[PDB]
């Protein structure tokens, strides 16, 4: 898609991820963990809820019959009431279809853009003491605990505290 | 070398929606924006409403038997339901249509008494067999059929004039009687040539009654057809006739507004709603609708669509 | 050493709505619907003519009131509230077409019919309805033709108009409805009354209506007007037996011009091409909640107080 | 928002920034330097301008009135106006509420794609030369004066000049 | 551009490719070589098929005449029409020229992503073993031939075999 | 160090398009959304259709000579023509654009016998020199112009009575002769007062130019008869009774157009001017169009953008 994430260098989805949109995996050498981001998920949740309380309404408007269900009508006025009503559903169906179609644009690229910006956001924080492999993970150059591995999904990795070791393991 | 992954949720079982550049995209999750099912219910709930049943509209003015429990009440909302009756007796209203939208369109209906007086050569108490009430012949309860006392004689030159003492506008209708051979005019309203004659300030107009065979309906050849007009606050209307005029003893007023449906569907007092059809109700909060583009109401816009799928979730990609 | 890139914000953002969002803070936005009007009428480029007290189909029949609009050419016709049509209590039937198509107009020219009457007739009917120069007259485009004589018969008169021009010509005629018997008798006779109308495209007959009704100014009598067009090169005549108001002058239409009601005054120093009941809409702005009655070229009506289109990035202060 | 930098990674906007929608502020040795974009400035609102002359506009089709203000109309037409006028302004709310809606939204992410491209213009000009911050600097590893700064702001930085000083610095 | 790629960081395009909408130049010791990328030509092409086929399309609503061609109607209801079709003509007129700018707005943007995409996909694949030039092009600080170049474009281009000539060769 | 670039495709001459932020836009290539072109044709392939030349549809109904190939059938498209005749003699219809309408909505026209008889006294065979049909006086097909056997003698007071013996509606068409002076109404008629009635369940009723050198006119009435119900004309003489009646069968699709047939082109969307065969969604040629058609829009051109930006060399 537009921002090359999702169904993009991201291989696929993880149906064992429930508490969440998107989030990580690690592995370290106490083993293995899944956590999912909130503000993310949530970034993107509220954006799709704005479409909704914007689409699922009516007018206000209050609108009384022109044409008669049980009586004939004149025949000059029905056909021009025909016409009309015709060329409105023409109009609405038209509506409806680009509307439809425009808004899920939109969100499969919005959803697209959070992931692509959560990825970003984590290759800024590892800085130096990390490289990344073209399938939407990042290979830390530094013995990254349970701690560590938290520290980076909580948004509070220091990479100075790492990047004398980082930096020796990448040039080796 | 230790790894971290970034990643999305999806499911095994995702939903098919249209972009703008993809008929066939797949996403984890999507919501319906078209109703496709109806209630065949008339949703009356918070609303003061009448089911006109087997009494038609314009029934309600003239006093047909059928609308006897319909000659006067208030209402938010109106039901009129299929081959409903107006006319006992053979005939129709001219500009019909717009009179049944008028009464569809109100809150509504009072009546006032003409106190039209007749002299003793007239009888004003003519009756048929087409509008029956307890088991015996009767006629319109709103209107009363003027004929000669003595038959055969001169219906004498006669003058009646309706004042509009409201402070709100009166609808009055009467009706000119057109029978069907030379004889049977001759034994109701005499051997002279016939003129009604009815004048308002904003109204005027000449009817002859035509006289003429046609085929029996109800085994009648006779036509009794309806007219009507407005009558403004503090304005008079007279009616000068010499025979075929059917005289109004009670006018009709349309209180405030209303909205009128046309419906088979029956009532139900338990559901509320602001959307009907010929069908029932539409009670969804969906924005669009392929039920009817007949519709009243605050109602969803009528699409040619059986399905239109809002995606509420990203791209779904499973393994 | 550091490089920072960054973008502007303001203390006082404006608040506009998105697909996703309904309070959304931008930096700067401009309004797309007008809520704002002139009560006044922009006839500035207009050759234009406000009929004041005169309505648009008492210019064909000739009113008092419209005494100074018997004929012209504009390319704005502007009609008012309460404006006199009729000084004999009376209508016209396809009165809304006839106004629509007179509003539609660029100008209205006469033509006199010729139209000449037996020493029989009385041709100088007048009315106290239809006062003139503090004496009793008529509509100056119609005659009333009454018999001479009092009580006496009515002679069958015919009365023909040929349309010599190459356009089409609007024709007007009134049929009298007298509220007794015996005024009828005192003015076209004893016998039944009969007008026929025929040309190429137009035929009908008119019976006079006699019979009791309320006064409207005094007066029990109707005169109701009818019209039709007569093609080029095309005739009508009027067979008559008494109760005809025949023309004296028939109408011409001349090009297209654009009609106005409004009760707005006239200001010839401002320009507009959007018209509504209370003024003129001058704004370059593609929507408006003024009115769903406009007339020109017109913003669209929306049920909306305020759109706010956003002209700046999203707003993020310090 | 969609690109990630506008209310992303950029904190905050500045409202001592008046010359420019977009721009630098720098320290070095010799102080502090502010700066504005104007390529990138002149870009979003070239884009503005464009939507402005597109939207602030009406047809220029006459319309005559087809109901009296001063007189009665018939009440069958009548109501037929009043259902065609009533379906009419239903339509254009909905245009309107809709162009309206949706311009915003790519105002809003137009602006905030002007801001990442400056951003990725700048990184990609100081090379191996700089990391980034994660806030929207970019720490400068080698000594970079007002003219070195001035330089990056034109678009004329010779990355290849300060490579041997810089690569020195950031290994340590 | 949104995604600053295309009338972006890539100065222009192409007029000698002829067998392909992206694709790659190279030069190393052999020579020269052009080649087209057949994936994200065929993701942009198949994009704009699908606006095809959902614009180029008319309602299969059947239409009456209510306006005589050959005799007068009578001039109120003549005005209703004039008025109704006119309303009409003015909504499918904005709905059209509004269709046409967004979709086009849209395939310009979306051809922008995939060229990114594609710059992006090549970036992570040289991993540490190249340099950005900023122009659309990458420095390779390895000696690269044909079929090293082929493995680029093959997306089988494996960083770890060239990776400690290519540091060497990056820090001097 | 060697290098390797990514880069798009260009061409020379690109085409201009308008987006939401620029009027001036150069792409690799665009493609039309609005139809300029029309075919001066009527594309009739693939539709069982009616041209009715000279005969207009009303004259389908009374049966004019113009119209003799056209008195009954089944089509799904009619074609009317301009000055197209209805009446041989003069006269007119009341309601005429009602009935024209009606037709022209119609897929087929069915024609069923009255059965009108009439008594000696009667003559039946009432013709005319405006309505010419193999060379002799003749008159409208469907319809019986009923005079006094001898000339003078008083017209006998009939009643004919048509029953709706089918299961749909039945189009009863009658004509009243207005003669031009007293002599000629006493010739065929007689010297009585004349009276025309006629009557249904729904419906009940009772100087000028010379056009070809005839100042006599027939003028038209028209009502539907329903199912079961009977129409009864009472008559003394004056009356143009009907000898067929009319059954409207289906719907088909009615142009108003000057343009010739081509039965090799198929359309779905007809103007006066020919036929609209595009794929395209936008037209500019009419607003005036029927049938199943790309909407009207006042744009000359829109084109669609079908490439990305063209940056060239
Ligand atoms: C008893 C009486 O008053 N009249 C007898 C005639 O009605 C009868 O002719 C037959 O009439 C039948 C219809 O009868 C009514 C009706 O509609 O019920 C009887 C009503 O009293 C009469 N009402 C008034 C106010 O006049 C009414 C009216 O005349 C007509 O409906 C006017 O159209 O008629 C039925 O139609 C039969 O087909 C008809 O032969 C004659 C002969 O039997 O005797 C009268 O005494
Ligand atoms: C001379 C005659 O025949 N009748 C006179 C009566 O009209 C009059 O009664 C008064 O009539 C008043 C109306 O008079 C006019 C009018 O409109 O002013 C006089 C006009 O000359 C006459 N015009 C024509 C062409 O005949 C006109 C017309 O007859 C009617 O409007 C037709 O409907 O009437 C008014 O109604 C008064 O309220 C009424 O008292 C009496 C007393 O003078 O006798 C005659 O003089
Ligand atoms: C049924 C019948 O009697 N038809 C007549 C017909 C009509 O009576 C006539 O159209 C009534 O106006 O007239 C026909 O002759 C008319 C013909 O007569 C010439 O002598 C004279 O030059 C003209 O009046 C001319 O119209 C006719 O054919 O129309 C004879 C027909 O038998
Ligand atoms: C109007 O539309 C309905 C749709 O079925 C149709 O039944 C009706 O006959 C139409 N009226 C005319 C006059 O074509
Ligand atoms: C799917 O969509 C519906 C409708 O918006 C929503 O209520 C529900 O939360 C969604 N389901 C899941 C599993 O997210
Ligand atoms: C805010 O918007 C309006 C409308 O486009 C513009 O004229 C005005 O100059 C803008 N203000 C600033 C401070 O940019
Ligand atoms: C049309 O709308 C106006 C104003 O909203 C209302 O007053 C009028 O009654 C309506 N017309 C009809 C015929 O109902
Ligand atoms: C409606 O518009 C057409 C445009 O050609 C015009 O010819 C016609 O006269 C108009 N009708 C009325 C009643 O204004
Ligand atoms: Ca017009």
Same mark, same amino acid.
């Given at each position: 898609?537009?921002?090359?994430?999702?169904?993009?260098?991201?291989?696929?989805?993880?149906?064992?991820?429930?508490?969440?949109?998107?989030?990580?995996?690690?592995?370290?050498?106490?083993?293995?963990?899944?956590?999912?981001?909130?503000?993310?998920?949530?970034?993107?949740?509220?954006?799709?809820?704005?479409?909704?309380?914007?689409?699922?309404?009516?007018?206000?408007?209050?609108?009384?019959?022109?044409? !008669?269900?049980?009586?004939?009508?004149?025949?000059?006025?029905?056909?021009?009431?025909?016409?009309?009503?015709? !060329?409105?559903?023409?109009?609405?169906?038209?509506?409806?279809?680009?509307?439809?179609?425009?808004?899920?644009?939109?969100?499969?690229?919005?959803?697209?853009?959070?992931?692509?910006?959560?990825?970003?956001?984590?290759?800024?924080?590892?800085?130096?003491?990390?490289?990344?492999?073209?399938?939407?993970?990042?290979?830390?150059?530094?013995?990254?605990?349970?701690?560590?591995?938290?520290?980076?999904?909580?948004?509070?990795?220091?990479?100075?505290?790492?990047?004398?070791?980082?930096?020796?393991?990448?040039?080796? | 070398?230790?790894?971290?992954? =970034?990643?999305?949720?999806?499911?095994?079982?995702?939903?098919?929606?249209?972009?703008?550049?993809? +008929? &066939?995209?797949?996403?984890?999750?999507?919501? +319906?924006?078209?109703?496709?099912?109806?209630?065949?219910?008339?949703?009356?709930?918070?609303?003061?409403?009448?089911?006109?049943?087997?009494?038609? /509209?314009?029934?309600?003015?003239?006093?047909?038997?059928?609308?006897?429990?319909?000659?006067?009440?208030?209402?938010?909302?109106?039901?009129?339901?299929?081959?409903?009756?107006?006319?006992?007796?053979?005939?129709?209203?001219?500009?019909?249509?717009?009179?049944?939208?008028?009464?569809? +369109?109100?809150?509504?209906?009072?009546?006032?008494?003409?106190?039209?007086?007749?002299?003793?050569?007239?009888?004003?108490?003519?009756?048929?067999?087409?509008?029956?009430?307890?088991?015996?012949?009767?006629?319109?309860?709103?209107?009363?059929?003027?004929?000669?006392?003595?038959?055969?004689?001169?219906?004498?030159?006669?003058?009646?004039?309706?004042?509009?003492?409201?402070?709100?506008?009166?609808?009055?209708?009467?009706?000119?009687?057109?029978?069907?051979?030379?004889?049977?005019?001759?034994?109701?309203?005499?051997? &002279?040539?016939?003129?009604?004659?009815?004048?308002?300030?904003?109204?005027?107009?000449?009817?002859?009654?035509?006289?003429?065979?046609?085929? &029996?309906?109800?085994?009648?050849?006779?036509?009794?057809?309806?007219?009507?007009?407005?009558?403004? /606050?503090?304005?008079?209307?007279?009616?000068?006739?010499?025979?075929?005029?059917?005289?109004?003893?009670?006018?009709?007023?349309?209180?405030?507004?209303?909205?009128?449906?046309?419906?088979?569907?029956?009532?139900?007092?338990?559901?509320?709603?602001?959307?009907?059809?010929?069908?029932?109700?539409?009670?969804?909060? =969906?924005?669009?609708?392929?039920?009817?583009?007949?519709?009243?109401?605050?109602?969803?816009?009528?699409?040619?669509?059986?399905?239109?799928?809002?995606?509420?979730?990203?791209?779904?990609?499973?393994?």
């Amino acid at each position: 898609g537009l921002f090359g994430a999702i169904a993009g260098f991201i291989e696929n989805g993880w149906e064992g991820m429930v508490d969440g949109w998107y989030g990580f995996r690690h592995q370290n050498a106490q083993g293995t963990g899944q956590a999912a981001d909130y503000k993310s998920t949530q970034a993107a949740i509220d954006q799709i809820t704005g479409k909704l309380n914007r689409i699922i309404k009516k007018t206000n408007t209050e609108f009384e019959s022109i044409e !008669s269900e049980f009586s004939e009508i004149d025949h000059q006025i029905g056909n021009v009431i025909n016409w009309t009503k015709d !060329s409105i559903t023409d109009i609405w169906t038209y509506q409806a279809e680009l509307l439809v179609a425009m808004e899920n644009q939109h969100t499969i690229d919005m959803a697209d853009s959070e992931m692509l910006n959560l990825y970003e956001r984590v290759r800024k924080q590892l800085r130096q003491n990390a490289e990344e492999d073209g399938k939407g993970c990042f290979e830390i150059y530094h013995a990254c605990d349970d701690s560590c591995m938290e520290s980076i999904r909580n948004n509070t990795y220091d990479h100075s505290q790492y990047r004398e070791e980082a930096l020796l393991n990448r040039l080796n | 070398p230790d790894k971290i992954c =970034l990643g999305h949720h999806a499911v095994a079982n995702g939903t098919i929606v249209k972009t703008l550049t993809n +008929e &066939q995209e797949e996403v984890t999750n999507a919501t +319906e924006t078209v109703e496709s099912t109806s209630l065949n219910r008339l949703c009356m709930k918070g609303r003061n409403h009448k089911d006109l049943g087997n009494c038609h /509209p314009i029934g309600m003015l003239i006093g047909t038997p059928a609308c006897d429990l319909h000659l006067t009440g208030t209402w938010d909302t109106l039901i009129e339901r299929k081959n409903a009756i107006a006319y006992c007796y053979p005939g129709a209203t001219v500009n019909e249509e717009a009179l049944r939208q008028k009464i569809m +369109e109100s809150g509504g209906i009072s009546k006032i008494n003409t106190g039209f007086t007749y002299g003793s050569s007239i009888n004003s108490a003519g009756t048929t067999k087409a509008c029956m009430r307890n088991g015996g012949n009767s006629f319109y309860a709103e209107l009363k059929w003027l004929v000669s006392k003595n038959k055969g004689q001169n219906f004498p030159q006669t003058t009646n004039t309706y004042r509009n003492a409201d402070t709100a506008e009166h609808l009055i209708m009467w009706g000119i009687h057109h029978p069907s051979s030379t004889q049977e005019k001759n034994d109701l309203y005499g051997t &002279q040539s016939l003129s009604i004659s009815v004048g308002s300030s904003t109204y005027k107009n000449n009817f002859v009654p035509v006289v003429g065979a046609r085929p &029996q309906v109800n085994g009648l050849s006779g036509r009794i057809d309806f007219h009507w007009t407005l009558v403004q /606050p503090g304005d008079k209307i007279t009616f000068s006739h010499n025979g075929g005029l059917i005289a109004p003893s009670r006018v009709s007023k349309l209180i405030g507004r209303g909205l009128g449906i046309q419906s088979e569907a029956p009532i139900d007092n338990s559901c509320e709603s602001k959307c009907f059809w010929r069908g029932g109700s539409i009670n969804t909060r =969906l924005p669009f609708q392929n039920l009817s583009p007949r519709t009243v109401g605050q109602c969803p816009k009528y699409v040619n669509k059986k399905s239109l799928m809002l995606a509420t979730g990203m791209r779904n990609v499973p393994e």
